[PDB]
Write an enzyme that holds these catalytic residues in place. Structure first.
Site, PDB file in Angstrom:
ATOM      1  N   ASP A  64     -20.752  13.967 -24.289  1.00 20.43           N
ATOM      2  CA  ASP A  64     -19.871  13.930 -25.870  1.00 20.43           C
ATOM      3  C   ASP A  64     -19.748  15.284 -26.493  1.00 20.43           C
ATOM      4  O   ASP A  64     -21.011  15.728 -27.052  1.00 20.43           O
ATOM      5  CB  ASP A  64     -20.830  13.170 -26.573  1.00 20.43           C
ATOM      6  N   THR A  65     -18.851  15.901 -26.700  1.00 19.96           N
ATOM      7  CA  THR A  65     -18.670  17.155 -27.292  1.00 19.96           C
ATOM      8  C   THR A  65     -18.616  16.980 -28.772  1.00 19.96           C
ATOM      9  O   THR A  65     -18.809  18.137 -29.469  1.00 19.96           O
ATOM     10  CB  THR A  65     -17.222  18.099 -26.842  1.00 19.96           C
ATOM     11  N   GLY A  66     -18.828  16.115 -29.500  1.00 22.77           N
ATOM     12  CA  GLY A  66     -18.713  15.824 -31.033  1.00 22.77           C
ATOM     13  C   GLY A  66     -20.174  15.606 -31.306  1.00 22.77           C
ATOM     14  O   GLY A  66     -20.391  15.631 -32.640  1.00 22.77           O
TER      15      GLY A  66
HETATM   16  C1  GAN Z   1     -25.142  14.495 -36.264  1.00 27.85           C
HETATM   17  O1  GAN Z   1     -26.076  14.745 -35.013  1.00 27.85           O
HETATM   18  C2  GAN Z   1     -25.313  14.082 -33.875  1.00 27.85           C
HETATM   19  O2  GAN Z   1     -24.830  15.114 -33.147  1.00 27.85           O
HETATM   20  C3  GAN Z   1     -24.736  12.843 -33.724  1.00 27.85           C
HETATM   21  N1  GAN Z   1     -23.247  13.242 -33.971  1.00 27.85           N
HETATM   22  C4  GAN Z   1     -22.458  12.438 -34.344  1.00 27.85           C
HETATM   23  O3  GAN Z   1     -22.699  11.069 -34.747  1.00 27.85           O
HETATM   24  C5  GAN Z   1     -21.111  12.683 -34.345  1.00 27.85           C
HETATM   25  N2  GAN Z   1     -19.897  11.868 -33.790  1.00 27.85           N
HETATM   26  C6  GAN Z   1     -19.961  11.440 -32.505  1.00 27.85           C
HETATM   27  O4  GAN Z   1     -20.798  11.829 -31.637  1.00 27.85           O
HETATM   28  C7  GAN Z   1     -18.835  10.517 -32.248  1.00 27.85           C
HETATM   29  C8  GAN Z   1     -17.819  10.335 -33.233  1.00 27.85           C
HETATM   30  N3  GAN Z   1     -19.282   9.018 -31.949  1.00 27.85           N
HETATM   31  C9  GAN Z   1     -19.384   8.106 -33.012  1.00 27.85           C
HETATM   32  C10 GAN Z   1     -18.391   6.746 -32.818  1.00 27.85           C
HETATM   33  C11 GAN Z   1     -18.081   6.168 -31.659  1.00 27.85           C
HETATM   34  C12 GAN Z   1     -16.568   5.545 -31.461  1.00 27.85           C
HETATM   35  C13 GAN Z   1     -15.618   5.701 -32.549  1.00 27.85           C
HETATM   36  N4  GAN Z   1     -16.729   4.189 -31.356  1.00 27.85           N
HETATM   37  C14 GAN Z   1     -16.240   3.235 -31.050  1.00 27.85           C
HETATM   38  O5  GAN Z   1     -15.507   3.435 -30.510  1.00 27.85           O
HETATM   39  C15 GAN Z   1     -16.577   1.712 -30.855  1.00 27.85           C
HETATM   40  C16 GAN Z   1     -17.074   1.279 -29.493  1.00 27.85           C
HETATM   41  N5  GAN Z   1     -15.452   1.004 -31.714  1.00 27.85           N
HETATM   42  C17 GAN Z   1     -18.544   6.295 -30.527  1.00 27.85           C
HETATM   43  C18 GAN Z   1     -20.256   7.160 -30.454  1.00 27.85           C
HETATM   44  C19 GAN Z   1     -20.728   6.927 -29.361  1.00 27.85           C
HETATM   45  C20 GAN Z   1     -21.275   5.403 -29.380  1.00 27.85           C
HETATM   46  C21 GAN Z   1     -20.479   4.265 -28.452  1.00 27.85           C
HETATM   47  C22 GAN Z   1     -20.893   2.974 -28.787  1.00 27.85           C
HETATM   48  C23 GAN Z   1     -21.450   2.592 -30.039  1.00 27.85           C
HETATM   49  C24 GAN Z   1     -21.854   3.514 -31.000  1.00 27.85           C
HETATM   50  C25 GAN Z   1     -21.824   4.739 -30.558  1.00 27.85           C
HETATM   51  C26 GAN Z   1     -20.106   8.814 -30.618  1.00 27.85           C
HETATM   52  C27 GAN Z   1     -20.624  13.497 -35.854  1.00 27.85           C
HETATM   53  C28 GAN Z   1     -20.985  12.151 -36.872  1.00 27.85           C
HETATM   54  C29 GAN Z   1     -21.224  14.576 -36.231  1.00 27.85           C
HETATM   55  C30 GAN Z   1     -25.454  12.121 -32.746  1.00 27.85           C
HETATM   56  C31 GAN Z   1     -26.341  11.085 -33.122  1.00 27.85           C
HETATM   57  C32 GAN Z   1     -24.458  11.564 -31.669  1.00 27.85           C
END
Ligand code: GAN
Lengths: 99, 99
Positions: A25-27
């Site tokens: 995960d790069t995000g």
């Molecule tokens: C803020 O600190 C962090 O690094 C956190 N980072 C994030 O949440 C960051 N986002 C992500 O990593 C991405 C966008 N993502 C969130 C939504 C996302 C996508 C949009 N969700 C879907 O497609 C669902 C299956 N409909 C998947 C996340 C992984 C996951 C998989 C299945 C169910 C729940 C979660 C990963 C942003 C908010 C900074 C970690 C807890 C992951």
């Protein structure tokens, strides 16, 4: 390897003696793994995400083998749906994004 | 270009005549932007992340220019923290993971 994104980028990791599949995960800044048996002491922390915040146990200096490459860093164990390998470890196994 | 990951992979997108900045996220299957003035008809949908579920408005066929590259896709607009470019648009600008 080169990984295109027409499918979720999962890879096998070896952590604490156990085999798991985690999403590259790069995000995500951090590595967050689903509840599993890990050796040692840890600190509570609360990480934020899009649906809100979850409480996790923080393990520092945990060795993990991501697709054959070994890395040592902090791992957050908690209520995550999918095991997330975030940027604190992707930088260690030399991973880049390209387009 | 080639993006290393010591800093967040943030890039400039142009959408609905507005300039935004967004995270290049391999871990997200969908693209989800912060609340914005966008024309059209949209559909109620709800997605999940860690911490849980948010209700978003989904819009199909919207043109996004990700670092100059044009792509037409489904964009979800709603109460996210960061704007996320997920795998449905990342496969269109040709992005790959390398290590
Ligand atoms: C803020 O600190 C962090 O690094 C956190 N980072 C994030 O949440 C960051 N986002 C992500 O990593 C991405 C966008 N993502 C969130 C939504 C996302 C996508 C949009 N969700 C879907 O497609 C669902 C299956 N409909 C998947 C996340 C992984 C996951 C998989 C299945 C169910 C729940 C979660 C990963 C942003 C908010 C900074 C970690 C807890 C992951």
């Amino acid at each position: 390897p080169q990984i295109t994104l027409w499918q979720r980028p999962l890879v096998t990791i070896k952590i604490g003696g156990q085999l798991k599949e985690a999403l590259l995960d790069t995000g995500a800044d951090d590595t967050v793994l689903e509840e599993m048996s890990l050796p040692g002491r840890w600190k509570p922390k609360m990480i934020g995400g899009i649906g809100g915040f979850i409480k996790v146990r923080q393990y520092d200096q945990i060795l993990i083998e991501i697709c054959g490459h070994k890395a040592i860093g902090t791992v957050l164990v908690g209520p995550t749906p999918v095991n997330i390998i975030g940027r604190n470890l992707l930088t260690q196994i030399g991973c880049t994004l390209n387009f």
